[PDB]
Amino acid sequence: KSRQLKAAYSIELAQDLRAVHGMDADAELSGILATEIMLEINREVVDWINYSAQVGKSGMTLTPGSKAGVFDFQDPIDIRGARWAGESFKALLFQIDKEAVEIARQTGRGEGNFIIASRNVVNVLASVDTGISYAAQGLATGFSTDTTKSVFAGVLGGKYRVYIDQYAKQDYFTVGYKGPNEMDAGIYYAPYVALTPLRGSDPKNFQPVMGFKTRYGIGINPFAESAAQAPASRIQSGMPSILNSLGKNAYFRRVYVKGI
């Protein structure tokens, strides 16, 4: 699938920008369009992961007394009888591993090894000793908790690579697995054309023409739904749709979080 955007700027405006700020505005407009495109691509990938990810705290991963998909840090069933935060926080780490185990159960290739989470989730992870201990809490040190230096927060227990989704709508976290081959990812981006610039002018008034076009495509591992011994008619598409993958991807599970 493809993408297309224009700058559509007037020359007089560019001339004033030079006169006032030393700006040409050509490179500036181009940079904005290219930046937006790159931003849109990275979001698309993240969004498809969440789209296709299964529900954590569900099925084999659900304690019968809970809410089927949300972890509430104030709820005794989710916090597994824990007292205040120094114990409650540990309970989430427990649930995460349970889900990582489920990932292996469905992919057949390995346990979850990476998490995308909100900044609040990470703040919690970074506030505790994730190893096996009597209790834990203090100022965050474990992970970067910011959103401006990096997106990569750090690694839980030396096992899971944790990244922050600064655009999460409320607060949730997805856990999943990426194997050593690109095809072992479940989810993949397969670019063909990137950032081809267009230039010109429009004789109507001869104002400048500028813009970009791209074309990529994404996809799903043939066995990603992990629930079938055959596709219909031996021929399928690896592209997402509701029917093809909403809530079906073996490589990832996600839950909502509350009480942080």
Partner: peptide
């Protein structure tokens, strides 16, 4: 949450190409 690009043919014929209509590119600036 969802995002996707457009079909290639939609893009291929934007800006009135081949008699198509109502097909402007989105625009940005500062």
């Amino acid at each position: 949450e969802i995002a996707e690009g457009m079909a290639t043919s939609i893009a291929e014929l934007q800006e009135g190409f081949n008699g198509s209509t109502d097909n402007p590119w989105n625009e940005m600036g500062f």
